Symmetry: C3
């Protein structure tokens, strides 16, 4: 799985250990081993949410399966919780796009996961 | 809606008010309330279009609905027009990927839109 | 076609000529003319792969067609090969998300490719 957070929160406001926490929590949430979790945090961005430059985040979670109605509600509660606690972003200023990737449409290690 | 523009135009060439202009125009074009429009501009990027490093932009628009052949033509004329007028990017050096997101695949406010 | 690579490798480790090499090799792999290939490299990123921060890459390839099981395996070999040779990223620390875009869902030059 791949989780990306783009945010206008400054780099200094991202706590040490945040990538590790995201890795651990996403491994537990998706049920996938942490070795297959990739995380990417992009602070200091020029962005707005609802016309406002108050703290916000635009995020994606790509996974081969483990994507669906109930799972995505649970991921959203988890990840909005982490962004509120660690980056002080309001949950109503977070979008998370979920992508259920076909194994044949994910490249890794000179081939695909198919 | 979530609109992202990645460009090699420098930050100083992005005019004041641009994120607000994008927010307003996307609200009107998509019909969505401005409170649901998120915009993200990423200048100073290392990118090429057709092998050339002349000004260019690589963009995405994700929306829950309001995506389709005629709508996307209209969005493209709007957004290429703004990028030409405001960032001096030629329309033929702009790509916009359109994504019709299922409500169950968008997280917001600790849940999803389903 | 549009190829994006996000990496923690520093900007100074991206060799001169890399965007041109990506453009050339993707034109040949996809069969599309180089005038239609866009490339974007984002170094110096805050990311982890499998819980660690040794060089890694998170990438996308969006293309109108020319996406499928065998083609994507070939793209993965080509692109992992380039990232290993040029950026010294291990192929097992690269993820590439492939997207087969409908022509009506790609904006360009004030309209779509439909």
């Amino acid at each position: 799985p791949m989780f990306i957070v783009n945010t206008n929160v400054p780099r200094a406001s991202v706590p040490d250990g945040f990538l590790s926490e995201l890795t651990q929590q996403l491994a537990q949430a998706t049920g996938k081993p942490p070795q297959y979790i990739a995380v990417h945090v992009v602070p200091d961005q020029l962005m707005a949410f609802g016309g406002s430059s108050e703290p916000c985040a635009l995020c994606s979670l790509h996974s081969i399966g483990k994507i669906g109605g109930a799972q995505n509600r649970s991921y959203s509660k988890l990840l909005c919780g982490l962004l509120a606690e660690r980056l002080r972003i309001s949950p109503d200023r977070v979008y998370i796009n979920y992508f259920d990737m076909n194994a044949a449409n994910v490249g890794w290690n000179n081939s695909t996961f198919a």
